[PDB]
Amino acid sequence: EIKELLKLGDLPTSGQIRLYDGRTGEQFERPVTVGYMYMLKLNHLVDDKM
Amino acid sequence: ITVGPYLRLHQCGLPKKMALELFKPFIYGKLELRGLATTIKAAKKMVEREE
Amino acid sequence: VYQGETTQTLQDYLMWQVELTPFSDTDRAIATSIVDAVDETGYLTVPLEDILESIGDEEIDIDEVEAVLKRIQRFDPVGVAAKDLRDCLLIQLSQFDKTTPW
Amino acid sequence: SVTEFLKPRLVDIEQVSSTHAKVTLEPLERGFGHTLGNALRRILLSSMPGCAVTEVEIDGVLHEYSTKEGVQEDILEILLNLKGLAVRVQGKDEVILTLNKSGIGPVTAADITHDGDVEIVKPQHVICHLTDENASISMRIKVQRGRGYVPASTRERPIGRLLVDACYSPVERIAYNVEAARVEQRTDLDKLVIEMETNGTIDPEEAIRRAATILAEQLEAFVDLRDPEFDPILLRPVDDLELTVRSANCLKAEAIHYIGDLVQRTEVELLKTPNLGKKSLTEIKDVLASRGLSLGMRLENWPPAS
Amino acid sequence: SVTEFLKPRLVDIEQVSSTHAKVTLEPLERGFGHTLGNALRRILLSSMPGCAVTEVEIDGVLHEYSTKEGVQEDILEILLNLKGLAVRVQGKDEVILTLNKSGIGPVTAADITHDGDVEIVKPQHVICHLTDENASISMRIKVQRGRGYVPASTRIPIGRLLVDACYSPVERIAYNVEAARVEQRTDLDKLVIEMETNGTIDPEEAIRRAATILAEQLEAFVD
Amino acid sequence: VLGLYYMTRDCVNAKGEGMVLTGPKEAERLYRSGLASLHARVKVRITEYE
Amino acid sequence: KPLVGTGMERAVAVDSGVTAVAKRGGVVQYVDASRIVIKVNEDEMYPGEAGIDIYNLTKYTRSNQNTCINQMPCVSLGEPVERGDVLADGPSTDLGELAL
């Protein structure tokens, strides 16, 4: 089902694309998994630690 | 603690806001040693203002 | 079990500044006596004759006591250890710049 | 030839939209396509100038953690909306715009009072909403030119003026491609296509020229490759101290001309000097202590160059 | 004010050998060390004019794996020795040199027939070795002018041995970016470039030529 | 460990396989120019001290 | 909103009590950044009363962990509502769904 939904949006089925280095413009030698994740900020702030 | 990949084996990365508090009497002595402060209160005030 | 914590008073601050000043042993003893003779409003509560008597030896004049007192009066706060109000105000004014209009 | 390098030139510009363009450079030798493309992408994403909102004053508000009656949004949301306003200023490096509105409906960027040297490229940009007939809003917005990202925390102010973080960069994204050029009678020449996405406040061609100018200015350094603040009182002369005749004579006999020279001498050395008694030394200590100074101080790198 | 950028104020050059140098430049704007270093490294590696040996022909050899009697090295080792020969040409863009030697000892670059145009950078470079008194070597070496590096496989008569053409004078080029600060600003770049050449030109001259080429590529847009 | 393991592996048919190099510096030049693979099997002249 | 969820976000958002939920159905008579007034439907009204509900929102209030509690409306002027609908989002809530 995930692969079908990827095909619907015209995206690669494996979930990996080709990326380029920002500093040099050279292509990384292998495909990289790129996508979206839900990230959280926890209540452990370095302002309250130092 | 975070990671510093550029460091050498004998080096560490210290925040300067911590190092200012940790080395305070050394800074007082060094300020008085070169004529920037003529009294201990002058050095204390200069360090407080963070010139 | 609970215990308090040390607090810094005016005399503690004055002695901290005395410790970090290039005095001699005799001058340091004179400064200790002078700071001991300072109340919480910042004024000297005894005449310099009592301080000279409390120094404990007769090889010392009153000019040395005056010089030590003048050095102490330039601590922080400025005007501390003054003989009277006029002395305190003059000490405070001596720290101003001549550019002051009035 | 071996040393005969074909220079690239700007061929054509395609305007897909008001905020999306393509720039073509041709011809390029073998390998120069990526060399120019990556440097141009980095410079375009890093160093282009633009204008942004930095300060806002609203009629009745005091801080940003509050609300205004008859307005749908919080003050923070209004500030975030103003942070996304696109403005092109033609004459100066700073300008102030005024907004007045009343009645039920959306308050957009087309309601900003007209100015001669200011252009609004997206008049439909929504700022807030008024939900009450008897409600009005009036604010003053400050715009200035810069480059980069300048948070408001890094940079008194009367109560009521709200600061906004400034993102001056007008470029949203850059992409580039290297294709085969169909040059007259050669098959080893390339062509560079740069796809640029902006906010509509900068012309693509002047952006390319500005990036090239920055690169050349940085390169010119490689094109030619080759290799005691003492306190004022310490500098004043000794005679500034109202010393007696004998004390001044004794000091001048020892070659002491400034306060910085006098304060470095210990009591023992002055005591061992001829013609100076204990009374004179006590007088010197008194006149020094009158200015918050003492004998026995230590200095380094003395005397200075003066 | 918005069109003014920091320029390198300290430019340090450290000489390790006659053809091995380090260059330090600071301060730079954030992210410019990578831009300049990568551009210069690409230009130095890939596009740089120079003269190099292209192919060889030996009378007694008709194949890359042929056997020559009286020489210690093989054919491949002789070709490797030829590839590392640094020469200067000022007359034309194609020259043919001849080598003839007999005896016992190291046959070096000082044994090449002299010419008014071609100059050998390092005569001490060793071509091969003769082990037998009745041994002899006779060969013809072609040198051309070009840019960069061209492998021999991409170019694939009788007894003609191809060599990889190393036109560029650069032996090695590398760069590194470190932290640098002015009194107030703290996130600035410091660029270190370490490079070695083959002796044809000085490293500083190579850096200057690369910068000149890159600057001349932009002449149409610089205003 | 992963990077050093990746750079010291070999592949059966890699770009620029079977050529003879004058030293490590030529190998680095070939890799950085995109003319050879990091895994190509070659012959290199090596000088080692004991 | 998470954009990849499980289907339990709405239950957590609504049952926690951090959002404003309509007590009776009606039409949004007044909307503002700090209050909402709903004009109740006639069939849900009691005899002898003015059929309006008023919701005062919590704005920038300190919590037990020294963080911010703030409610924002998610309805427009004049639109219909039903009993149980969400009128204002609480902290970490997006259109009635948990958004952490």
PDB file of C-alpha atoms in Angstrom, chain A:
ATOM      1  CA  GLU A   1       0.000   0.000   0.000  1.00  0.00           C
ATOM      2  CA  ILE A   2       2.882   2.384   0.735  1.00  0.00           C
ATOM      3  CA  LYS A   3       4.405   1.629  -2.672  1.00  0.00           C
ATOM      4  CA  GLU A   4       1.037   2.165  -4.376  1.00  0.00           C
ATOM      5  CA  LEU A   5       0.634   5.534  -2.658  1.00  0.00           C
ATOM      6  CA  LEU A   6       4.185   6.419  -3.722  1.00  0.00           C
ATOM      7  CA  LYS A   7       3.279   5.563  -7.319  1.00  0.00           C
ATOM      8  CA  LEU A   8       0.164   7.738  -7.073  1.00  0.00           C
ATOM      9  CA  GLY A   9       2.300  10.766  -6.186  1.00  0.00           C
ATOM     10  CA  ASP A  10       4.905   9.972  -8.885  1.00  0.00           C
ATOM     11  CA  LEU A  11       7.697   9.076  -6.465  1.00  0.00           C
ATOM     12  CA  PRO A  12      10.309   6.295  -6.469  1.00  0.00           C
ATOM     13  CA  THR A  13       9.028   3.036  -5.011  1.00  0.00           C
ATOM     14  CA  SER A  14      12.193   2.213  -3.045  1.00  0.00           C
ATOM     15  CA  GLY A  15      11.940   5.475  -1.101  1.00  0.00           C
ATOM     16  CA  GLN A  16      15.485   6.531  -2.009  1.00  0.00           C
ATOM     17  CA  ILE A  17      16.684   9.363  -4.249  1.00  0.00           C
ATOM     18  CA  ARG A  18      19.988  10.835  -5.410  1.00  0.00           C
ATOM     19  CA  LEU A  19      21.434  13.676  -3.330  1.00  0.00           C
ATOM     20  CA  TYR A  20      24.219  16.162  -4.034  1.00  0.00           C
ATOM     21  CA  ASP A  21      26.773  17.617  -1.648  1.00  0.00           C
ATOM     22  CA  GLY A  22      26.112  21.267  -0.894  1.00  0.00           C
ATOM     23  CA  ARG A  23      29.765  22.167  -0.370  1.00  0.00           C
ATOM     24  CA  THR A  24      31.118  20.591  -3.574  1.00  0.00           C
ATOM     25  CA  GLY A  25      28.139  19.762  -5.800  1.00  0.00           C
ATOM     26  CA  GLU A  26      29.237  16.133  -6.171  1.00  0.00           C
ATOM     27  CA  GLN A  27      26.705  13.311  -6.157  1.00  0.00           C
ATOM     28  CA  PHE A  28      26.749  10.871  -3.257  1.00  0.00           C
ATOM     29  CA  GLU A  29      27.691   7.414  -4.476  1.00  0.00           C
ATOM     30  CA  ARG A  30      24.594   5.586  -3.186  1.00  0.00           C
ATOM     31  CA  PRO A  31      20.884   6.445  -2.991  1.00  0.00           C
ATOM     32  CA  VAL A  32      19.730   7.923   0.311  1.00  0.00           C
ATOM     33  CA  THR A  33      16.456   7.424   2.170  1.00  0.00           C
ATOM     34  CA  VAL A  34      14.778  10.849   2.260  1.00  0.00           C
ATOM     35  CA  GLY A  35      11.346  11.540   3.697  1.00  0.00           C
ATOM     36  CA  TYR A  36       9.319  13.107   6.507  1.00  0.00           C
ATOM     37  CA  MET A  37       9.367  12.361  10.229  1.00  0.00           C
ATOM     38  CA  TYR A  38       7.454  13.806  13.177  1.00  0.00           C
ATOM     39  CA  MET A  39       9.989  15.302  15.591  1.00  0.00           C
ATOM     40  CA  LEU A  40       9.474  16.536  19.151  1.00  0.00           C
ATOM     41  CA  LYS A  41      11.315  19.044  21.337  1.00  0.00           C
ATOM     42  CA  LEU A  42      11.781  17.710  24.859  1.00  0.00           C
ATOM     43  CA  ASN A  43      11.846  19.740  28.061  1.00  0.00           C
ATOM     44  CA  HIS A  44      15.628  19.348  28.519  1.00  0.00           C
ATOM     45  CA  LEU A  45      17.003  22.736  27.469  1.00  0.00           C
ATOM     46  CA  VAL A  46      20.708  23.574  27.696  1.00  0.00           C
ATOM     47  CA  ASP A  47      19.715  27.008  29.012  1.00  0.00           C
ATOM     48  CA  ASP A  48      18.580  25.306  32.230  1.00  0.00           C
ATOM     49  CA  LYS A  49      21.689  23.073  32.380  1.00  0.00           C
ATOM     50  CA  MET A  50      24.790  25.248  31.986  1.00  0.00           C
TER      51      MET A  50
END
